[PDB]
Design a protein around this ligand. Structure first.
Ligand SMILES: Nc1ncnc2c1ncn2[C@@H]1O[C@H](COP(=O)(O)OP(=O)(O)OP(=O)(O)O)[C@@H](O)[C@H]1O
Ligand SMILES: Nc1ncnc2c1ncn2[C@@H]1O[C@H](COP(=O)(O)OP(=O)(O)OP(=O)(O)O)[C@@H](O)[C@H]1O
Ligand SMILES: [Zn+2]
Lengths: 481, 258, 483
């Protein structure tokens, strides 16, 4: 018994001995110290931490909740994300605040990225410009989820001259970094959680104009796993390093890595982009070649939407392949990818398929995203759509998935289906009033009906309904006389 | 809100009250499991013909989880030694979900109606005295033929009336001010919300498509389907539409006959 | 014939008694050998040759083997000032706008200071295959056509296309002559705004003190300094704001007029942005302060939409204020202002008012905006909406000025109302086919109805029709078969 209680330890350690990762982490939370009824023994606790290092096979680093106080327009707002649906979409009016939450999550991950990388520096605190006018403190409290153990993190800044109340207890990110560092130590071929952030500036990077002159090809970039997070928590993505990557891989193709990673990355944009095949490089003027419906075009005059959706998934796939070692399925790892303004330079035929394609291609990735187009919204269940409004969170109305655009507008975006002050819709309202007001055919409803009939035609849905009403009511005047 | 008539108890809500004087509703739900709760829900719904007391919509006849039971006088207003307002079988009504599924308390107030916006009103304006009997219409003691509600065919709203509101009295109040009672009944529950004003306006669509043919026989069939018995959903609005058509009214009372 | 042309003696008399501008403008060519080369005397073209209210408006365009297009002809309207080209992302919409850009740069050049150039068709801008490329543009100032063509040959095939930059030189000469008679003469607003309008406003770019340090002098041609690159020069607007406020401070310090332009520029911005008032300059570390509902914020912390709208409207207002001195209504002028993706970083509510509000505040201005959002499309007549599909022009169906977003989305965009692969729309169709059939009330029909009612609720408009028709069929079938 080792003088320690063998009841609860054995109740909670059998699965750990079997291979469960959560039980070992739970053990090395109280076994070493004296926080529960267990004695302060440091043998089994350290053995459990060492063993739990080598127990991560499949998981997902996911943001679970965020708590903000006086950060940026928000007095207090406690989000609660999803651990089953891998897509949360924030919807609201421009001015209520969505990039506030996105920036808060980015600030939270700026320290996790450093904790997981070989470095140990800190990220960024709350700037002076990120405090409410006439306010004294702020907090960015965020919790994370690996295979099932909650890991907190608080990033708070207070003005010394007014009050000193809040603290900054990073805590669990250090433990997570210890787990991943030990996992690398036991075996370098271990998957890491991706972290990425994509602002509204993804477009201003895609250009193959003097790559040799500009940057990122006149270096000796060593392709490793830890440093893949370069410029990942920033705005514009990496297309020039992307082109460096194609150059190196295609030139070395001339073993297995060239046949695997290059093929998989190609298939990514091959599936996302309907009709862009047979990628190849251009050597003399140093550009890219794409075959759009069997005509060859460079990457300097392709459609802007194709450019953005190229760079986005290209960066995601590149970082997933760099972070993951030799594996049959290298795009299915883990990560928290934030994509602000998904409905950016896109056509209403791709906005209805952007999310399912992302989830089918990259399965085990969280995709906290903000949108402003209904066609993006009604592809996802209502339980995963927040409607931030007036500084407080309201969840989307019931049954958004598989709905119609007009209803989504009216009942979620607070936008009228018809234009609010178009003269023809005001005439339509006046007609609808006249039909039901026992005053039809008094020389003032017929002219307006003809005016609306000449514009919409005799086939518009609502006008046919009003025609049915007038026909039935002119039937009434017959049998009553 | 129609006029629902309760029949009698079945000596199974009697035994539970006998073994436990004070009232806690969650205790009744977390009883020997689903049996008593299943059968109370069944016996309550069958008296209402599987319809909602507040907003007349079709409750699913083969899925309990879409069926909820609402206490008219709120269960938050029970007083120890004053009343037992959790289990009296005159405060139980069968209601829909009301635009919510989990009751997260973070759903839009405008969408919520029928039953949940009652609670939303109570929280928002801090109605301390949960004695709604007298200010909101009780769907158990109304007249069986109510001319209360006027169907505004334009937007689908249900609006108060001048006639029949200064004639009949409810809950012993003076008959000269029932209009305020009806208006507050509309406000507390939002029968005039989007998801119901755009659902009652389609019964008008049906009634007017069954009149395109200019055939009185089809209108006869529609009237004998909408005014025969076994009330269907939105029966009150059905009755208003039949009562607002002079051809239909003539057909049902002699003059103008086929 | 001759000697006042007895065939057209009345016509020549009408042109002589002009009393206007159109009847006194073409007289220069009429006395300058309009029919054929004769009578080049300058005395006739002195009082009949040597401007208050006009509209420099692009009328048509023609493209040959430029970008993906092979042959396409547009004809923009004249009475109404709006064009909302819509098309699939990939077929083409920026080719037309970039073509008008390559056309308008030469005009802006040849009226700014001197006659010169700087944009021609590049090699990558050539149709894959076809060699000759042409971008033909034709203007309209008070009802006169001014042709313009650009050309480029790949293998030196200098036989199929040439560049006759004619007529626009005449337009530049007319404007410069108008300037000579009176410096205070109105000029157009040739401008463009690409998809990168707001990628210039930044908190460090609000602080400045290290970016713009010079002695810029405001003149009319200042509005033509980098007006066709695809950015909103918010920094120069900030400099102009600072100069205006500092000269106001100097004036009212000397006090212890000339400021109405500031009020007009601010009022233009206050109308579009809702609740944004009290715009003031911070002499303390150089910033700009905006008041939102009695809350003093900074440009650094405004959301993306307000940044974009402020930059765009400030640029346009500044340019028209400079271009129209001593004008009681400075923000009227004329222009061919081109905007790409006017539905970018905007809420659906703001999109429904973006076009009418611009056309109200800036009335005598042309816009050839391109849109992807249906919410913008249903505020303007269908005769002004041009659909670009498969490299060709198709006109939009009638009835667009006011309509449900679903109809526009499913007719002008070829996109289904409901998602086409969602597993709750396939079930909807599978249940609706059962309802409108002879297998109603079948067990599978009940299961699908319950599944759909649990998700969309029991008051969805589609579900109500289906249940009413099921009631109809059950009533009719049972009643008839029992009898
Ligand atoms: N420190 C502050 N002082 C005053 N107002 C503030 C402050 N912080 C935030 N706000 C207000 O709250 C709003 C927050 O803007 P925000 O960028 O977060 O909107 P968003 O819609 O969530 O982002 P995006 O447009 O990128 O989607 C500001 O526009 C501003 O009106
Ligand atoms: N030299 C070329 N060869 C082949 N195709 C070309 C060429 N130049 C342009 N294109 C065509 O132009 C199309 C994309 O150009 P474009 O930028 O006009 O589309 P867009 O996305 O609608 O633009 P925007 O959204 O910015 O208005 C591509 O399908 C491409 O095939
Ligand atoms: Zn209900």
């Amino acid at each position: 018994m080792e003088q320690n209680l063998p009841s609860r330890i054995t109740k909670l350690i059998k699965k750990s001995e079997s291979g469960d990762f959560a039980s070992s982490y739970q053990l090395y939370k109280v076994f070493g110290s004296k926080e529960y009824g267990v004695e302060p023994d440091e043998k089994m606790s350290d053995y459990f931490k060492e063993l739990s290092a080598k127990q991560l096979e499949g998981g997902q680093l996911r943001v679970a909740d965020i708590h903000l106080e006086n950060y940026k327009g928000f007095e207090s707002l406690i989000m609660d994300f999803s651990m089953k649906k891998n897509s949360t979409i924030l919807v609201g009016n421009n001015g209520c605040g969505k990039s506030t939450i996105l920036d808060a999550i980015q600030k939270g991950l700026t320290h996790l990225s450093s904790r997981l990388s070989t470095r140990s520096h800190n990220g960024d605190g709350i700037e002076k410009h990120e405090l409410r006018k006439g306010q004294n403190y702020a907090s960015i409290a965020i919790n994370y989820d690996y295979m099932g153990i909650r890991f907190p993190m608080i990033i708070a800044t207070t003005e010394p001259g007014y009050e000193d109340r809040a603290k900054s207890n990073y805590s669990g990110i250090n433990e997570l970094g210890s787990i991943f560092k030990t996992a690398h130590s036991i075996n370098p071929n271990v998957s890491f959680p991706l972290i990425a952030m994509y602002t509204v500036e993804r477009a201003n990077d895609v250009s193959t104009r003097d790559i040799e002159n500009s940057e990122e090809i006149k270096e000796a970039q060593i392709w490793d796993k830890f440093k893949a997070y370069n410029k990942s928590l920033t705005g514009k993505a990496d297309f020039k390093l992307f082109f460096r990557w194609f150059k190196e891989l295609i030139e070395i193709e001339n073993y297995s890595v060239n046949s695997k990673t290059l093929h998989t990355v190609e298939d990514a944009m091959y599936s996302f982009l309907p009709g862009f095949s047979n990628l190849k490089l251009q050597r003399a003027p140093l550009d890219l070649i794409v075959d759009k419906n069997n005509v060859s075009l460079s990457v300097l005059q392709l459609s802007q939407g194709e450019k953005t959706i190229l760079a986005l998934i290209a960066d995601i796939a590149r970082r997933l392949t760099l972070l993951n070692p030799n594996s049959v399925n290298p795009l299915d790892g883990t990560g928290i990818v934030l994509i602000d303004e998904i409905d950016l330079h896109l056509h209403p035929s791709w906005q209805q398929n952007i999310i399912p394609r992302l989830e089918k291609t990259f399965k085990n990735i969280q995709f906290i995203v903000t949108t402003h187009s209904p066609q993006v919204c009604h592809t996802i269940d209502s339980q995963n759509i927040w409607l931030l409004k007036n500084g407080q969170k309201f969840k989307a109305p019931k049954g958004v998935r598989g709905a119609i655009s007009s209803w989504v507008l009216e009942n979620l975006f607070e936008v009228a289906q018809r234009p609010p002050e178009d003269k023809y819709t005001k005439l339509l309202q006046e007609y609808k009033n006249l039909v039901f007001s026992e005053k039809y055919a008094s020389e003032d409803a017929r002219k307006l009906g003809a005016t609306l009939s000449q514009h919409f035609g005799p086939d518009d849905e609502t006008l046919v309904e009003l025609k049915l009403e007038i026909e039935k009511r002119i039937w009434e005047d017959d049998f009553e006389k | 809100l129609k006029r629902i008539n309760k029949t009698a108890e079945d000596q199974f809500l009697i035994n539970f009250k006998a073994q436990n004087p004070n009232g806690t509703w969650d205790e009744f739900r977390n009883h020997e499991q689903g049996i008593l709760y299943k059968r109370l829900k069944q016996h309550i719904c069958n008296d209402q013909m599987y319809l909602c007391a507040y907003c007349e919509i079709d409750l699913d006849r083969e899925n309990e989880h879409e069926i909820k039971v609402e206490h008219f006088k709120s269960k938050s207003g029970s007083l120890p030694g004053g009343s037992n307002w959790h289990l009296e079988w005159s405060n139980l009504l069968a209601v829909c979900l009301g635009g919510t599924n989990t009751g997260d308390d973070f759903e839009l107030p405008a969408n919520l109606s029928c039953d949940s916006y009652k609670s939303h009103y109570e929280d928002k304006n801090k109605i301390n005295d949960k004695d709604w009997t007298g200010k909101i219409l009780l769907p158990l003691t109304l007249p069986d033929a109510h001319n209360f509600f006027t169907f505004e065919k334009v937007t689908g709203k249900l609006l108060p009336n001048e006639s029949y509101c200064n004639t009949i009295s409810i809950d012993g109040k003076p008959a000269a001010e029932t209009l305020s009672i009806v208006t507050k009944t509309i406000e507390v529950l939002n029968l005039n919300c989007s998801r119901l004003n755009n659902a009652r306006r389609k019964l008008l669509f049906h009634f007017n498509n069954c009149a395109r043919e200019r055939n009185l026989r089809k209108l006869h069939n529609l009237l004998l389907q909408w005014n025969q018995g076994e009330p269907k959903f939105f029966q009150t609005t059905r009755d208003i539409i039949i009562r607002d058509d002079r051809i239909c009214q003539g057909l049902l009372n002699g003059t103008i006959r086929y």
